Design an enzyme around this catalytic site. Sequence first.
Site, PDB file in Angstrom:
ATOM      1  N   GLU B  11       0.625  -1.145   0.034  1.00 54.39           N
ATOM      2  CA  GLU B  11      -0.147   0.034  -0.122  1.00 54.39           C
ATOM      3  C   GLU B  11       0.847   1.309   0.176  1.00 54.39           C
ATOM      4  O   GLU B  11       0.362   2.312   0.247  1.00 54.39           O
ATOM      5  CB  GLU B  11      -1.009   0.064   1.281  1.00 54.39           C
ATOM      6  CG  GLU B  11      -1.996  -1.269   1.270  1.00 54.39           C
ATOM      7  CD  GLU B  11      -3.163  -1.007   1.961  1.00 54.39           C
ATOM      8  OE1 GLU B  11      -2.766  -1.079   3.028  1.00 54.39           O
ATOM      9  OE2 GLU B  11      -4.319  -1.004   1.622  1.00 54.39           O
ATOM     10  N   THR B  16       0.294   3.087  -8.134  1.00 54.34           N
ATOM     11  CA  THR B  16      -0.537   4.465  -8.403  1.00 54.34           C
ATOM     12  C   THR B  16       0.662   5.203  -9.228  1.00 54.34           C
ATOM     13  O   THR B  16       0.269   5.903 -10.108  1.00 54.34           O
ATOM     14  CB  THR B  16      -0.699   5.138  -7.081  1.00 54.34           C
ATOM     15  OG1 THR B  16      -1.551   4.118  -6.454  1.00 54.34           O
ATOM     16  CG2 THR B  16      -1.615   6.255  -7.429  1.00 54.34           C
ATOM     17  N   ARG B 146      -8.029   0.862  -5.200  1.00 53.63           N
ATOM     18  CA  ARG B 146      -7.318  -0.133  -4.443  1.00 53.63           C
ATOM     19  C   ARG B 146      -7.410  -1.363  -4.836  1.00 53.63           C
ATOM     20  O   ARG B 146      -8.715  -2.111  -4.879  1.00 53.63           O
ATOM     21  CB  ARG B 146      -7.583   0.077  -2.828  1.00 53.63           C
ATOM     22  CG  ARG B 146      -6.924  -1.305  -2.198  1.00 53.63           C
ATOM     23  CD  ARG B 146      -5.411  -1.027  -2.159  1.00 53.63           C
ATOM     24  NE  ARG B 146      -4.660  -2.081  -1.391  1.00 53.63           N
ATOM     25  CZ  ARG B 146      -3.574  -2.688  -1.887  1.00 53.63           C
ATOM     26  NH1 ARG B 146      -3.049  -1.749  -2.703  1.00 53.63           N
ATOM     27  NH2 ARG B 146      -3.044  -3.517  -1.097  1.00 53.63           N
ATOM     28  N   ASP B 168       6.666  -3.736 -11.474  1.00 50.61           N
ATOM     29  CA  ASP B 168       5.859  -3.331 -10.215  1.00 50.61           C
ATOM     30  C   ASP B 168       5.688  -4.760  -9.736  1.00 50.61           C
ATOM     31  O   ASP B 168       5.539  -5.867 -10.224  1.00 50.61           O
ATOM     32  CB  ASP B 168       4.556  -2.765 -10.856  1.00 50.61           C
ATOM     33  CG  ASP B 168       3.482  -2.269  -9.590  1.00 50.61           C
ATOM     34  OD1 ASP B 168       4.087  -1.901  -8.723  1.00 50.61           O
ATOM     35  OD2 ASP B 168       2.106  -2.084  -9.986  1.00 50.61           O
ATOM     36  N   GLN B 172       3.454  -6.788   0.305  1.00 50.73           N
ATOM     37  CA  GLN B 172       3.454  -7.646   1.445  1.00 50.73           C
ATOM     38  C   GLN B 172       4.517  -8.629   1.688  1.00 50.73           C
ATOM     39  O   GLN B 172       5.167  -9.170   0.616  1.00 50.73           O
ATOM     40  CB  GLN B 172       2.123  -8.494   1.515  1.00 50.73           C
ATOM     41  CG  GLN B 172       0.710  -7.494   1.742  1.00 50.73           C
ATOM     42  CD  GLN B 172       0.469  -6.754   0.483  1.00 50.73           C
ATOM     43  OE1 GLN B 172       0.980  -6.974  -0.777  1.00 50.73           O
ATOM     44  NE2 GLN B 172      -0.010  -5.635   0.650  1.00 50.73           N
TER      45      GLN B 172
HETATM   46  N1  LIG Z   1      -4.314  10.394  -1.062  1.00 51.10           N
HETATM   47  C1  LIG Z   1      -3.376   9.596  -1.701  1.00 51.10           C
HETATM   48  N2  LIG Z   1      -3.963   8.296  -1.945  1.00 51.10           N
HETATM   49  C2  LIG Z   1      -2.611   7.475  -2.351  1.00 51.10           C
HETATM   50  C3  LIG Z   1      -1.545   8.048  -2.517  1.00 51.10           C
HETATM   51  N3  LIG Z   1      -0.622   6.987  -3.257  1.00 51.10           N
HETATM   52  C4  LIG Z   1      -1.339   5.794  -3.246  1.00 51.10           C
HETATM   53  N4  LIG Z   1      -2.462   6.205  -2.793  1.00 51.10           N
HETATM   54  C5  LIG Z   1      -3.528   5.151  -2.717  1.00 51.10           C
HETATM   55  O1  LIG Z   1      -3.343   4.392  -1.829  1.00 51.10           O
HETATM   56  C6  LIG Z   1      -3.883   3.062  -2.080  1.00 51.10           C
HETATM   57  C7  LIG Z   1      -2.549   2.171  -2.229  1.00 51.10           C
HETATM   58  O2  LIG Z   1      -2.005   2.478  -3.324  1.00 51.10           O
HETATM   59  P1  LIG Z   1      -1.284   1.301  -4.251  1.00 51.10           P
HETATM   60  O3  LIG Z   1      -0.567   1.965  -5.522  1.00 51.10           O
HETATM   61  O4  LIG Z   1      -2.222   0.453  -4.628  1.00 51.10           O
HETATM   62  O5  LIG Z   1      -0.119   0.757  -3.304  1.00 51.10           O
HETATM   63  P2  LIG Z   1       0.954  -0.321  -3.703  1.00 51.10           P
HETATM   64  O6  LIG Z   1       0.489  -1.854  -3.010  1.00 51.10           O
HETATM   65  O7  LIG Z   1       2.270  -0.059  -3.332  1.00 51.10           O
HETATM   66  O8  LIG Z   1       1.072  -0.783  -5.330  1.00 51.10           O
HETATM   67  C8  LIG Z   1      -4.679   3.261  -3.413  1.00 51.10           C
HETATM   68  O9  LIG Z   1      -6.026   3.191  -3.229  1.00 51.10           O
HETATM   69  C9  LIG Z   1      -4.053   4.620  -3.973  1.00 51.10           C
HETATM   70  O10 LIG Z   1      -5.064   5.163  -4.771  1.00 51.10           O
HETATM   71  C10 LIG Z   1      -1.007   9.445  -2.211  1.00 51.10           C
HETATM   72  O11 LIG Z   1       0.038   9.920  -2.619  1.00 51.10           O
HETATM   73  N5  LIG Z   1      -2.064   9.953  -1.813  1.00 51.10           N
HETATM   74  F1  ALF Z   2      -1.211  -3.928  -3.626  1.00 47.75           F
HETATM   75 AL1  ALF Z   2       0.637  -3.716  -3.103  1.00 47.75          AL
HETATM   76  F2  ALF Z   2       2.318  -3.889  -2.507  1.00 47.75           F
HETATM   77  F3  ALF Z   2      -0.179  -3.727  -1.235  1.00 47.75           F
HETATM   78  F4  ALF Z   2       1.028  -3.584  -4.734  1.00 47.75           F
HETATM   79 MG   LIG Z   3       0.335  -2.601  -6.298  1.00 50.78          MG
END
Ligand SMILES: Nc1nc2c(ncn2[C@@H]2O[C@H](COP(=O)(O)OP(=O)(O)O)[C@@H](O)[C@H]2O)c(=O)[nH]1
Ligand code: ALF
Ligand SMILES: [Mg+2]
Lengths: 131, 316
Positions: B11, B16, B146, B168, B172
């Site tokens: 997350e 994103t 998400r 990407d 977890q």
């Molecule tokens: N408000 C806000 N939401 C964010 C930001 N970056 C990510 N998100 C939100 O946080 C959630 C997790 O982001 P995601 O890119 O899926 O995380 P990942 O698991 O690292 O790929 C998503 O619903 C995104 O829209 C940010 O800088 N600001």
């Molecule tokens: F959805 Al993730 F790291 F929590 F890409």
């Molecule tokens: Mg992701």
Amino acid sequence: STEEATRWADSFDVLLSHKYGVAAFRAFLKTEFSEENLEFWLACEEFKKTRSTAKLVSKAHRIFEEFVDVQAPREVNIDFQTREATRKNLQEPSLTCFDQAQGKVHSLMEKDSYPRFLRSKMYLDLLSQSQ
Amino acid sequence: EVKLLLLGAGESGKSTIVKQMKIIHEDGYSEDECKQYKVVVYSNTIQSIIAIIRAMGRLKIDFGEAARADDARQLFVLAGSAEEGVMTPELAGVIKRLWRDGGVQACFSRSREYQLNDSASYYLNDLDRISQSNYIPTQQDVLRTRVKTTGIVETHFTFKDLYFKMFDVGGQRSERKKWIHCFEGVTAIIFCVALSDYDLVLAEDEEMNRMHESMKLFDSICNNKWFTETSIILFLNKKDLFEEKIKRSPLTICYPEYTGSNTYEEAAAYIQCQFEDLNRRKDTKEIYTHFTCATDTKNVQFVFDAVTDVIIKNNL
Ligand SMILES: Nc1nc2c(ncn2[C@@H]2O[C@H](COP(=O)(O)OP(=O)(O)O)[C@@H](O)[C@H]2O)c(=O)[nH]1
Ligand code: ALF
Ligand SMILES: [Mg+2]
């Protein structure tokens, strides 16, 4: 063949109901290093068909050790709440032992991997080659 | 060619940033592509209000009004009603009454004590708009979605006459044994850190502070011998959420030794310092840090431009 390959795109569950759709999705998941999700899901489907208690108890333990435990070699991406519910269910295994974890993994494949499958070179080649 | 890894804990904002590369540097989100995210917007909304309601038991919080009890029962039964991408007026109204309830809001305020999507209030506050039968997700609605990533996903795009091979990954703990597959010949890593994680726990281990986890992970990555020559870029992300949260949740939750202010500028600066201190080869290696809002296209475009310049300059 083309009607079947195009049927896989109708929904994730329609894909899963076709042996050849499952095989294609497996090959795709290997390219993204996420095939544990499908093998766990299939293991759970097989588990639900079990007819004896000794067989049920053993298979529940094997599935848990292989896919659910934090140290599992093919540990599936599920949260603590889901993993812990599963752990508790394993104390008196029933046919619904993995339902929560299986649902989570189904959602993970459906929302993340499956849309990319439908746009993949692999799937597009299968379609163009079909019939 | 530039091989670019998006790394970080769950997350943190990785995917994103990936959506932003499509928006800025690849083809963007067509209306038809937006429509494909409708069922995700609905699911994120429904799952978020369910999560808050469920937590009210753990937290010993009652509904502001008794009549909400039946709305909650209705919500659980209806939760599947929108899997085909239709939010019924009935479901929409159930959710609206629950979200406006004072007990529910008291629970929402304490969301660090459970697991709640960052975009929950974004969607719930826009329920009227998103619940219309004709609803088409906007580009920001898409950015806010998400969807948990599993595995390793490669895409490509071109920028400043460079061909980017972008990876990407899932963040977890269970996913991280897979990362080694992509560790060869890495030109650059963008390591994402959710600034707003400082008072949260891991979904996969509710007795681990999320920022502490991120620090351990950055320590591991930054100092990995695989990356000696790799440009290490640090996105201190969710700056917008952090700005809001810092005014109500003290940084000392994460860093008990912190004696600075609970203000954006000071607290942000301190977090940057804590991450940059994890570099055990400071005489030898730079960390290129940026404060980011991954959902803000203008911001990510500006930051990624700067990042690309660093990569060009480091491959001369
Ligand atoms: N408000 C806000 N939401 C964010 C930001 N970056 C990510 N998100 C939100 O946080 C959630 C997790 O982001 P995601 O890119 O899926 O995380 P990942 O698991 O690292 O790929 C998503 O619903 C995104 O829209 C940010 O800088 N600001
Ligand atoms: F959805 Al993730 F790291 F929590 F890409
Ligand atoms: Mg992701």
